[PDB]
Design a protein around this motif. Structure first.
Motif, short mmCIF file in Angstrom:
data_model
loop_
_atom_site.label_atom_id
_atom_site.label_comp_id
_atom_site.label_asym_id
_atom_site.label_seq_id
_atom_site.Cartn_x
_atom_site.Cartn_y
_atom_site.Cartn_z
N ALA A 194 0.84 -1.18 0.00
CA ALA A 194 0.00 0.00 0.00
C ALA A 194 0.88 1.25 0.00
N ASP A 195 0.35 2.34 -0.53
CA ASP A 195 1.15 3.55 -0.68
C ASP A 195 1.68 4.04 0.66
N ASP A 196 0.93 3.79 1.73
CA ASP A 196 1.23 4.23 3.09
C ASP A 196 1.55 3.05 4.01
N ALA A 197 2.05 1.95 3.47
CA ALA A 197 2.31 0.77 4.27
C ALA A 197 3.41 1.02 5.30
N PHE B 7 -2.94 -7.47 4.71
CA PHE B 7 -3.29 -6.88 3.43
C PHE B 7 -4.50 -5.97 3.58
N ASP B 8 -4.59 -4.97 2.71
CA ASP B 8 -5.69 -4.04 2.71
C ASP B 8 -6.78 -4.54 1.79
N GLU B 9 -7.85 -3.76 1.71
CA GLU B 9 -9.02 -4.15 0.94
C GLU B 9 -8.80 -4.01 -0.56
N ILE C 101 -0.08 -4.91 0.56
CA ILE C 101 0.43 -5.11 1.91
C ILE C 101 0.29 -3.81 2.68
N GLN C 102 -0.47 -3.84 3.77
CA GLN C 102 -0.62 -2.70 4.65
C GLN C 102 0.45 -2.66 5.72
N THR C 103 0.73 -3.81 6.33
CA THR C 103 1.79 -3.93 7.32
C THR C 103 2.60 -5.19 7.06
MG MG Z 1 -5.23 2.70 1.72
#
Ligand code: MG
Ligand code: DNX
Ligand code: DNX
Ligand code: CL
Ligand code: CL
Ligand code: MG
Ligand code: MG
Ligand code: MG
Lengths: 127, 127
Positions: A33-36, A107-109, A113-115
């Motif tokens: 993700a852009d902000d992961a 993972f995000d929606e 990958i979020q974290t």
């Molecule tokens: Mg997002």
């Protein structure tokens, strides 16, 4: 895509290791993700955002030769998360060394990958 | 003890698997903080406290024969946490089946398990 199913998590996490193994820094970063956030090793403060994450993969993969391979199956969840065991093979001052790691990811929606949290400490390094 | 060092985490997490492998329900429960949580599998709501945790291990280990073994090294941190890959071998309706799991644990400042998260989903079960 949406929040990945357990099967989709197993595919994404294995694809991440494939991209690490070949060293395709730009394709790796796209998986996030852009902000992961990344915590490497777990216990250290997170880095944030795709540019910092790109810098992290440039630092780790751009130098000497690096390989990475799963050492067992991905364990996935039904809430878009998973954990995987792997080994990274690299070189230290020209001599073959390995690092055993477990990554935990959420993972995000959108299937990114979020974290990422990379569990390892110095005894997981072997020369 | 205090918050376990990385080496101490590796010893505690391996000892946990040993206790699971023999099925010593009471010794397992003692490894947990009195108010610990367990998430099994990760993605489900936590259970809370030693009596619920004891009930969980009685349900999982008291029936048919169960074995458990690390499938690679413990990955520890310097903040009292770790992750480990293992396989559980059991029996289902009399036939040998296995479950591949990664547990993530955080220990408290007394060396007891404060949180346990067991990553796995149904495809990690094999008959
Ligand atoms: Mg997002
Ligand atoms: O330690 N590391 O650098 C590391 C940790 C976890 C990873 O998923 C990948 C890397 N790497 O690209 O080398
Ligand atoms: O799935 N399980 O039951 C399970 C999950 C994680 C564990 O550390 C132990 C068990 N068990 O005692 O069987
Ligand atoms: Cl494994
Ligand atoms: Cl391993
Ligand atoms: Mg490859
Ligand atoms: Mg044993
Ligand atoms: Mg306490």
């Amino acid at each position: 895509m949406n929040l990945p199913t357990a099967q989709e998590v197993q595919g994404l996490m294995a694809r991440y290791i494939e991209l690490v193994d070949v060293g395709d820094i730009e394709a790796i970063v796209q998986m996030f993700a852009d902000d992961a956030t990344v915590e490497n090793p777990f216990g250290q403060p997170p880095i944030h955002g795709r540019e910092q994450i790109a810098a992290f993969f440039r630092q780790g993969l751009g130098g000497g030769k690096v390989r990475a391979c799963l050492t067992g199956p991905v364990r996935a969840s039904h809430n878009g998360c998973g954990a995987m065991p792997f080994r990274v093979e690299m070189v230290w001052n020209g001599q073959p060394c390995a690092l055993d790691v477990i990554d935990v990811m959420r993972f995000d929606e959108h299937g990114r990958i979020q974290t990422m949290q990379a569990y390892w400490s110095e005894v997981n390094l072997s020369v």
